[model samples]
Target: LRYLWRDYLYPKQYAWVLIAAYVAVFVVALVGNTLVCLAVWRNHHMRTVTNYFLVNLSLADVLATAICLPASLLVDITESWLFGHALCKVIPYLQAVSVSVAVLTLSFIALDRWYAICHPLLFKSTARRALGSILGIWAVSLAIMVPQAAVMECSSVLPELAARTRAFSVCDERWADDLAPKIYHSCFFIVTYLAPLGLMAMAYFQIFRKLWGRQIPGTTSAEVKQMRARRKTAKMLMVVVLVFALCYLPISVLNVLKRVFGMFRQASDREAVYAAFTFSHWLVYANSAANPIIYNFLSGKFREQFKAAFSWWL
Candidate 1:
């Protein structure tokens, strides 16, 4: 009675719209992220503990775009996984790992900035330490994706239905039915998304506490300039965090609904469901593209570095 995959039928003009949308997202996401990485690489002044995290974040987003976007768009537009079963098994894992690491990197960047401002004397960060943090994110992210890789595979939704037409493959996840998948997905959401948001909340709280109503003496010991710089940095990061929430929270909500309420168990309107997912996918890519722009506009230091790098190339 119940089936796993439902192939969505698309209208002709709408199909053209999807192609344009997907192509735009691919170019914007990949090229923007690459620019971010390059900006960081081209400027020595951009090398700091927090900026290193930003570089790592950009790298993660670039990989996520590359690993997931093309496959995801093709699957959504055509309602099938054209890539072989072997590819189906791998991309989701890499995509998930990239996003998880990016999120975790953001969380650390928040903490790193907070540490530099509130407790600079005590927590003097180094590039060596930052490198270790990046490596750690990579390892932990990879480990977190173990379940996804194991569960993801290409499978036919309705063999009988598929027989009459051009059979399309659904790249779907198959987890243990013994409350295990629920537990895993729950952990994934909490660990990767919710927990990072929580960390950022604390960071923001602490930053605002220190920044607001904290008066500095007329003759200061680098406190005033340091305070202003840290404040700007914190605000830039907060804006990035806000953007991430806006872009990703809906998809996360959809995921919770699907897991908890069997939202996709029996879709009466397959078109709407696929459309929602396509929008969610596009929004996620937009986040990747937007972060570099966020940094460019909000971060004076980053902007200066970027300009110097650009001028050198010119």
Candidate 2:
């Protein structure tokens, strides 16, 4: 309704700091991720299978951060859902899709690295196959978030129940029964965060063992350099995965806490609970910004391209 968007239009107290944080995340994530795509695009040598997955990851972050995050920023600060009921479904769904895409892309990168290093003769991944795999990842990611769209709804609290004694709306899960929310969130936690992380960790563990232990006789300087470069790449990717785990940890714990364990039912400090949720949500966006930085830090090729990329604008 028109009244829904009319009143209660401003942010909470001391929200400027939170607003600044989200703005920085938006600018950094957009600029950094765009450079990642362009780095791969402008260089033929950079067009490898792993690089393609990185591009997919960038695209997912770009789309979600660009479109969905602004609404969420408002939701966090105003402590209410705007954009009426329509986007309450679409935005959260797309956000979930982005998370799923990111997780799958990272997992695929680990899988590709594992096979390339540990089982080179078994499964070869060409550019064409990588493209096909990207498509499949998108399909799978989109499919997994259908339930998110279905369950998201716009809810309004009455004046009697409000923290400030005013009515305001929020977009949240609207499931059929208590058991459904618990079950769905548990499943969402496993599917989005835990399981993929576990699998990738195992894959990288295998990759590390293979890469670190190999030392062939009669190896030339050039061969040793190549081996060192591969090891550097593995380390970089492992950091990326590790960063993902750390960024998502708070939100994941909060989800299980609130949805599964029902920890926020009667909190003495409402402000603390709200702040916790807001910071955790922002960390997910921070993860998007952090990836390109990690890539630039760990990969010489990407770092070189990032340096050259600034010159193009100047």
Candidate 3:
């Protein structure tokens, strides 16, 4: 906090830039995610199992950005926990749930594609089973996050003997230090990213193998169409996994590092860590902003729908 004030805020030159960048990202994320939700809700063509996952993904992103980003920016600029102890406790919990849901939804999309490619007959039969999966994802996510949310409270920390002579005692609750948050973060990382990504990798590898084996010397019209569909699905799945890894893995690593290293830190180190922390938080927020663009680029249907919806205003 002190480092932020001394290095960033006290200078005043870059503070407005920080504020403006955050506001711009927040507004754009809100608009893009909202448009995705609106298109899925209003367009009948978007009601497929695949679109269901996309819609839910967008919804999660919207909620994550809306609930987490502004409050975070406020905390950053003010250099004090201005939102009170209650919000500090609850907001992180809520943010975890939303982010977990988003990750799970992406996993679900990959698994859905896997099924579609690997077991066409069974996939067709189970196409109607998506609602159950969606419901279960949210239910499990909420169940995991609720305990973390409950433990958030405001408290004061006494300074060390030497620092006590110089620095004021800090008055903020350790929301992320408890057992519940630790367990929640661990469970979220494994179930949402590790397991899903593994399944997606295996699924896509087999899918490519099957496509490769089936290609013929002289392809007919039907074969050509089938090959195109297979390639499209393969491309979409690759993009999904790549984007997920690119956006999330660094943030996840940094979070775990903070958890492990944050305990034995001096005031200056703590302040510097917090500044880095804020930057990483924004990078994760930027993840939400990237998904819709990924969707438009990877899926022809999404691109068409996005353009049609915006053509009048564009």
Candidate 4:
């Protein structure tokens, strides 16, 4: 671990900035998302099907904050993993599952909203369906990471090489095939991201169209309730959709492009790549923290519940 011990991506003064930033993000994400979980659990009015999906999304983000970001920060600080081989194998699986479930849950939320608005009776009994969907999302997320976990190893680089070239306990994926990474990442991008995004986009588009046209007139109480449901939360949900797109688009774009062509290769400059990686990681973690604010400000029900929910703490 010669170069590993020596490389400093940023100035020492700025290391404090990054460390402070990550700690702030970690606390916010953990506390905010936990509050979200608690709010939903406490109030049945807040425990709508859509909110349940959001609770799951927050759960994913909380896992990511507790599991992924801190671990990576530790690696950045120590320049090698302090956690042993089991952690190395396990952490990436957690990361993959968290990200997948979050995105897929968002997509499902969009679909549910669309169905609730457009065909109220078609997908009746949403919580039951959502439970099944959440289970399926978990299954799919774990399944996708099986091969990745199989290949990931917490081992040294260049064991036979001199001390100058060797890097110990470096978590690396040793793919047997030349195209394995490309194929794997591409599949992940398409299945976990692009397709789900497309579905969400379509759902939202139709939802907006149905709302926009003033074409819906309901004879039944269910449809009337559905219309009322959209009034307060539709705007909030839109913002969430936009947030997901904005936060995830950067990494997905770069990752997909790299898999597609060599020309879209990683930056050769160490400082540039390093800065980008740090910034990207920070941005993604911020997604976990953003939901708390959205809930407090965007929904009147949540705002009311939040005040009462935490009033006991004071």
TM-score of each: 0.88, 0.91, 0.80, 0.87
| Pairs in steric clash, model 4 | 1-166
Predicted candidate 1 versus true structure: per-residue lDDT over 240-294, tens digit per residue: 8899988988788777667755687665766577678778877887788888789
Point out where model 1 deviates above 4 Å: 1-13, 158-167, 216-221, 305-314
Model 2, stretches more than 4 Å misplaced?
1-10, 158-167, 220-223
Model 4 per-residue lDDT tens digits across residues 1-314: 33432446224435777788889989988988888888888888777878888889998999889989998776655456557678888887788788888988888888788887777787675688888888898888888787767777776656553244423557767777768778888888888778888888888888887776674454588866756668668778888878877878877776666554533343445455555556666767888888788888998887877798678777
Model 4 poorest ten-residue lDDT run = 4-13
RMSD of each: 3.6, 4.9, 5.0, 3.7
Q: How would you encode candidate 3's per-residue C-alpha lDDT over 276-298 as one tens digit per residue?
A: 66676776777778777777888
Best by lDDT: 2
- Model 3 clashing residue pairs (backbone): none
What is the C-alpha local distance difference test score of each model?
0.78, 0.88, 0.70, 0.77
User: lDDT of candidate 2 vs native?
Assistant: 0.88
**What is the Cα-based TM-score of model 1?**
0.88
lDDT of 2 at 57: 95
| lDDT value for model 1 | 0.78
